[PDB]
């Protein structure tokens, strides 16, 4: 079918964000395993997998709209050097992606690509849940203290 | 059946206590989830459910005695801003409810409404169990220290 | 996350509506059990439980947006004195709540809080199902006659 | 195979009758659900499904005889405004369809299309069962009274 | 409930589209069986059933909004005389229905009938899935050649 | 542990090759689904997943050797415009990766990183199996003819 | 079969390393149980069992090559007096064994005893896994602090 060109552009922009998040979260996950914080690492690994599923949905939609999915580009990965930075890096990445998705929904609405809007709404819901999780973890560090927070992730 | 009007007044007073506790404990439960203290949040959620079952028993008894249950009124909720205050707010609320129930029992005994007395005895037992639980949590915070206590609630 | 303050005010307005409905329908459900209309009482009880679930969803959303859920306030309960009035009281309550949710959806859309719009959409759908059920019960009373309607609610 | 053109015209006439009935009974079934008479609505829905099966059999037979099935045309639906009229509308529709099928059987016999006669015989039998059911419902309304009849259709 | 009269008009317009598609796809399904292309016939039969379920949802919504569903009218059926034409006729029909649904969504949004909008969004999604399927079959015919395509449908 | 710096460099070079292959094969897989060649698309999808597993093993080894895995870089994706080109693109990518892996093994051997050598040997075995598969598919096209080959992939 | 005398010498050198590790890790395991650090004790016990299986494989290979396995000799055990020292003593022992195995591999390659080489490769892999585990425990002690680390081992 012939999709709106700007909708395909938003699908490819959010795809670049998802590919960036797959790699960041995958790297962070294996880094947490390497550090011996496997409980947090497992949660991080599942977030990487969730971004792979988002990327897969975007790619399928782009083909349906007759566009070419862009798997070539990546944003700069935000890599933490300890657990508090790791969480803040992931938070910054999801906050940036949230903005793309919110603008994509308003665009889909305006060009009456209402099925692409429902894909982006699903993504936005998952993105806010992940932001809420990250904000909670960063606040827990301060309340339980870093050493206890790290102990709980072993 | 025509119940004693002052027994029905005590049943409605305690129903107001129970509705206030449903709401305080439900709000506290969801606040604890929001803070990432899910273990304590799950327990607080079960206390809210316990108060809904007390309210249900009071409402059933009031109808049976030809009264109208009062679901309109609520006491001021005691909302904590952190875990220590949350526990102290629940304790204060249960101590106030315990005083109403002890008074209601003495009154049901004096007017020989012995089945209403048995319902209030069941509530008084559950209330003391909750007060004991709360007083223990408050003492544990001082023994294990607040950072450990909160770590254990994640 | 920092939610829009007017979206939070709509989530809180709808939370007061849901809290009112929990209590009206719970009271109505136990009143129906007391009258011996336990079939209708069981359905009314399940509607109260459905409102507790809507309240729970709104409370979670308000915390996520950094707001404080309002469990202190309640609208005036509309309490029926017989089965026809009980159904009419529930219908008036759901019609007023429908008006809030529909306004809240339009506001979420205009400030681009699309996740909060999806919560309100789900509640709107549940609310129209409930309104349809109530309008149907009021019409059935008229078609089968009140004494048959009540007979059918006995168990 | 080359079927008799007048047999194909009867298969198509009966197909229009079945298509009309699918739609009348589907609409009636959903109308009964909307009114809260779900027991009668479920039975009406199963009659609509039964007509879809008859339509399917006629369409297959028409293709086998090298004809083209007519799904474009429909008779005027007879839509009731209440339960007594709904049943009377269904009865009028089945009585008119009975007349077509009975004529079609006589024609199949006279041109020795005996397989098409057996399809029409099966439909005739189903149609008389449906007519008997409808006449019985109309008589029950009179014997138990409309308010009891409707009560019994609530669920 | 009293629905918007123009929303009910869109629900009835789409109901006419769906009834036309039930019949076109059922006829095409049985024609494919008659031709010995049972695999494609089974798929076309399932698309007809899918349109009956869409029609059922529209009828239920119209009653709920105090309208009368229109099962009297049908559009002209687009009947193919071979497999390539059959697929092109279904595609043309779904493209026309897609235009009605997109218009109905924009209208339900403008008048704030947001539950009717959600029903039309579900239909629009199913419709694009079917259009994608049809456009793919038409492209496969040119890639594998018509004789192979038909062989695969036996 | 302190890994040889050039071993880590080879692990990161083969990681870039694996990330390139994940994306190429994932894109090719969903493109084959879009074209209606799902049997080939499923096989392509499983090759993408196999490259994800290779990438995961490389990343874990790099952390163990105290290096930082590079998920930022990608080679130019070789994207086909039809099935014969798709297969030739995948073949060219695996032939290029084969050279990196063969040089990595000789390097690991020379610096006595014998455990990294065994990882690269496993990769080389999987790479040759995939090359053999691709060479076979390209020869089958010529023997059965393209239209039959495509028909068999539907 | 007549094995190379220097290969048999390496098999016996590594057998001495393995016997020393069986005993060091078994003693450390039972010391950890004695101290009440059962979780860490269970892991240390499984490492001792792993070294018994390595010793068993070396003994079998030596017999096969017509040598006599040396179970008479042991290196000096490195015994810790607390948990941090215990971990550092195991790490030192595994680092020394890793050096013998890397040398033995290079020698088996040079004299073309390729089956003995494959046995030493298996041991080298298991050894690096244990070294990585130990280096991680030592880093966790500094991140979570010694009191938390020990708490987690109870
Ligand atoms: C184009 C980017 C990618 C896409 C679309 C993608 C897609 C997928 C999908 C759909 C799954 C299965 C999800 C499920 O059903 O459970 C999966 C699994 C996985 N992916 Fe990815 N992926 C991508 C990139 C990566 C990267 C860059 C890595 C690591 C370097 C990776 C590692 C994994 C792992 C370890 C699994 C688990 C699969 C298994 O063995 O069960 N992926 N991927
Ligand atoms: C009149 C006040 C209320 C009454 C009488 C009431 C009654 C009940 C009862 C009897 C139950 C099931 C008890 C059981 O586990 O067997 C229940 C469940 C529940 N109530 Fe309430 N409730 C009230 C107010 C509330 C409020 C304010 C909330 C706040 C959201 C709430 C949320 C819930 C939830 C989440 C459940 C769990 C539902 C389930 O899965 O079974 N309730 N309520
Ligand atoms: C008002 C138009 C129609 C409506 C609303 C309708 C509705 C339905 C529904 C809801 C089903 C079952 C859906 C499911 O699988 O769960 C069904 C089944 C079926 N319909 Fe229709 N239908 C319509 C017209 C037709 C027409 C024109 C035909 C042509 C013969 C037809 C033939 C069938 C057949 C063969 C089945 C399968 C029955 C079974 O085994 O369950 N329908 N219909
Ligand atoms: Ba601790
Ligand atoms: Ba009766
Ligand atoms: Cl702990
Ligand atoms: Cl009865
Ligand atoms: Fe995502
Ligand atoms: Fe209580
Ligand atoms: Fe609600
Ligand atoms: Fe029929
Ligand atoms: Fe449809
Ligand atoms: Fe690979
Ligand atoms: Fe060993």
DSSP codes, chain F: ----HHHHHHHHHHHHHHHHHHHHHHHHHHHHHHHT-HHHHHHHHHHHHHHHHHHHHHHHHHHHTT-----S--PPP---SSHHHHHHHHHHHHHHHHHHHHHHHHHHHHHT-HHHHHHHHHHHHHHHHHHHHHHHHHHHHHHH-HHHHHHHH-
How much distance in Å is there from the Cα of D87 to the middle of ligand 11?
A: 16
Sign of CA dihedral C72, C75, C79, C83: negative
- For chain C, the first-to-last Cα distance in angstroms comes to 50
In angstroms, the CA C150 to CA D48 distance is: 32
Q: What angle do CA F116, F120, F124 make, to 5 degrees?
A: 170
How many Å lie between the centroid of ligand 9 and the Cα of residue B92?
13
Sequence-distant (6+) residues with CB within 8 A of B61 are B11, B115, B116, B119
Q: How far is CA A150 from CA A41, B82, F139, G152, in A?
A: 12, 22, 56, 11
Distance (Å, rounded) from C-alpha C14 to C-alpha D100? 59
Closest to D105 measured CA to CA, from D7, D16, D3, D19:
D7
| Residue A152 · residue B147 · CB < 8 Å | no
Going by CA atoms, what residue is nearest to atom 38 of ligand 2? Answer: C49
Task: Find the CB nearest E60 among D23, D30, D72.
Answer: D30
Alpha helices (H) in E36-82, listed in sequence order: 38-64
Method: X-ray
* Contact exists between G and E (3 or more beta carbon pairs < 8 Å): no
Residues from chain E contacting residue F151 (CB–CB below 8 Å): 144, 148-149, 151-152
D55's tokens:
């339509």
Q: Determine the residue of chain A that is closest to G149 in CA distance.
A: A151
Q: At what angle do helices D5-35 and D83-111 cross, to 10 degrees?
A: 160
What sign has the CA pseudo-torsion D8, D13, D19, D25?
negative
Q: In the structure encoding, which two tokens stand for residue F46, read together?
A: 């499983």
Do F and A make contact, counting contact as 3+ CB pairs within 8 angstroms? yes
- Which of the 8 DSSP states describes residue A31? H
Q: How far is G122 from chain F (nearest CA, A)?
A: 9
Instruction: Supply the angle between the helices G83-111 and G114-144 in degrees, to the nearest 10.
Output: 160
Query: Do E154 and A24 touch, CB atoms closer than 8 A?
Result: no
This structure's resolution (Å) is 2.0
- B34 → chain A, closest CA residue: A136
Q: Which residues contact D128 (CB under 8 A, 6 or more apart)?
A: D98
Query: Cβ(A55) to ligand 1 under 6 A?
Result: yes
Q: Are E16 and E8 in contact (CB under 8 A)?
A: no
Tokens at D52, concatenated: 């879809």
Q: Is C10 left (phi over 0), alpha (psi -120 to 50) or beta?
A: alpha
Neighbours of C26 (CB within 10 A): 23
From ligand 12's centre to the CA of E123, what distance in Å?
A: 6
> Could you give the C-alpha distances from D145 to D139, D141, D151, D153, G46, in angstroms and in order?
10, 5, 10, 13, 84
Alpha-carbon distance of A110 to A91, in angstroms, equals 29
Most distant CA pair in chain C, distance: 55
Cβ C139–D34 below 8 Å, yes or no?
A: no
Give kind and range of the element (H or E) at residue B44.
helix B38-64
Within a 10 A sphere around the Cβ of D85, how many other Cβ atoms? 12
Residue A4, classified by CB atoms within 10 Å of its CB into exposed (0-12), middle (13-18) or buried (19+), is middle
Residues A144, A137: Cα–Cα separation, whole Å? 10
Q: Rounded to a whole number, what is the distance in Å from the CA of F114 to chain G's nearest CA?
A: 7
- Smallest CA-to-CA distance from A65 within A122, A121, A107, A6 is with A6
Question: C-alpha distances in angstroms, B13 versus B9, B72, B106?
Answer: 6, 12, 15
Distance B18 CA to ligand 9 centre (A): 5
Decide: D56 in ligand 3 pocket, CB within 6 A: yes
Closest to E140 (Cα-Cα) out of E33, E39, E36, E23: E39
Is C27 touching ligand 2 by the criterion CB < 6 Å? no
**How many Cβ atoms are within 10 Å of F23's Cβ, its own excluded?**
23
Q: What is the DSSP letter of B77?
A: P
| Residue owning tokens 């088996």 | G108
Question: What CA–CA distance (Å, rounded) separates B26 from B32?
Answer: 10
Tell whether ligand 1 has an atom less than 6 A from the beta carbon of residue A19: yes
Q: Tell me which residue of F133, F117, F120, F134 sits closest to F18, measured CA to CA.
A: F120
Residues counted in chain F: 154
How far does Cα F46 stand from its chain's mean position? 11
Cα atoms in the Cβ-side hemisphere of radius 13 Å centred on C145:
11
Q: What are phi and psi of G12, to 5 degrees?
A: -65, -40
At A129 the three-state DSSP class reads helix
**E105, E106, E132 ranked by CB distance to A1: nearest:** E132
* CATH number (domain holding residue C71): 1.20.1260.10
Give the whole-angstrom CA distance, residue G147 versus residue A146.
14
Cα separation, G93 vs G18, whole angstroms: 10
CA distance C64 to C86: 36
- Per DSSP, the three-state class of E6 is helix
> 3-state DSSP call for residue A49?
helix
Q: How many angstroms separate the alpha carbon of residue E91 from the centre of ligand 3?
A: 21
Q: Whose CA is nearest to atom 30 of ligand 1?
A: F55
Q: CA C9, C13, C14: angle at the middle one, nearest 5? A: 120
Cα angle for residues A46, A59, F90 (degrees, 5° grid)? 95
Residues 6+ apart with CB under 8 A from D3: D62, D64, D65, D66, D67, D113, D116
Q: Are the Cβ atoms of C59 and B30 closer than 8 angstroms?
A: yes
Give G34 to chain F, closest Cα distance, Å: 31
CB C123 within 8 A of CB D125: no
| Whether the CB of E23 sits within 6 Å of ligand 3 | yes
Our separate counts of H helices and E strands in chain B read 5, 0
Per the listing, tokens 């081992």 go with G153
Q: Determine the residue of chain G that is closest to F115 in CA distance.
A: G125
Do C and D count as touching (3 or more CB pairs closer than 8 A)? Answer: yes
Q: What is the DSSP string of F107-152?
A: HHHHHT-HHHHHHHHHHHHHHHHHHHHHHHHHHHHHHH-HHHHHHH
**Among G19, G30, G44, G33, which Cα is nearest to G97's?**
G19
Q: What angle do CA A80, A86, A88 make, to 5 degrees?
A: 110
Mutate to test the interface with E, among C96, C104, C128 (most CBs of E within 10 A): C128
Is the alpha carbon torsion for B34, B39, B41, B42 positive or negative?
positive
Q: Is A75 left (phi over 0), alpha (psi -120 to 50) or beta?
A: beta
Identify the three-state secondary structure at position B148: helix
Closest CA to G120 of F114, F7, F57, F111: F114
The structural domain count of chain G equals: 1
Residue of D49, D54, D58, D74 with the most ligand 3 atoms within 8 Å of its CB, for mutation: D49
F47 CA to middle of ligand 8, Å?
23
Judging contacts by C-beta atoms under 8 Å, the chain A residues touching residue G139 are 35-36
User: How far is B57 from D132, CA to CA, in rounded Å?
Assistant: 53
The set of residues, in sequence order, having a beta carbon less than 8 Å from that of F154 and lying 6+ positions away, is E140, E144, E152, F36, F37, F38, F39
Residues of chain A with Cβ-Cβ distance to E121 below 8 Å are: 114-115, 118
Q: Which residue has the tokens 């040598």?
A: G67
- Where in the sequence is the domain holding F22, given as residue range(s)? 1-154
- Of all helices (H) and strands (E), which one includes residue A138? helix A114-144
Residue appearing with tokens 């020869």:
F139
Ligand nearest to the CA of D154: 7
DSSP chain C: ----HHHHHHHHHHHHHHHHHHHHHHHHHHHHHHHT-HHHHHHHHHHHHHHHHHHHHHHHHHHHTT-----S--PPP---SSHHHHHHHHHHHHHHHHHHHHHHHHHHHHHT-HHHHHHHHHHHHHHHHHHHHHHHHHHHHHHH-HHHHHHHT--
Using only the alpha carbons of chain G, give its radius of gyration.
17
Cα–Cα distance for residue pair A121/F63, rounded to 1 Å: 37
């Amino acid at each position: 079918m012939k999709g709106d060109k700007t909708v395909i552009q938003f699908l490819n922009k959010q795809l670049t964000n998802e590919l960036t998040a797959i790699n960041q979260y995958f790297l962070h996950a294996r880094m947490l395993n390497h550090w011996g914080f496997d409980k947090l690492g497992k949660h991080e690994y599942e977030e990487s997998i969730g971004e792979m599923k988002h990327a897969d949905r975007l790619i399928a939609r782009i083909f349906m709209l007759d566009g070419l999915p862009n798997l070539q580009d990546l944003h700069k990965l935000l890599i933490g050097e300890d657990v508090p930075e790791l969480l803040a890096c992931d938070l910054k990445l999801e906050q940036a992606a949230h903005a793309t998705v919110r603008e994509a929904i308003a665009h889909c609405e305006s060009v009456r690509d209402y099925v692409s809007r429902d894909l982006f709404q699903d993504i936005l819901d998952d993105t806010e849940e992940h932001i809420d999780y990250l904000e909670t973890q960063i606040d827990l560090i301060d309340k339980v203290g870093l050493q206890n927070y790290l102990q709980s992730q072993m």
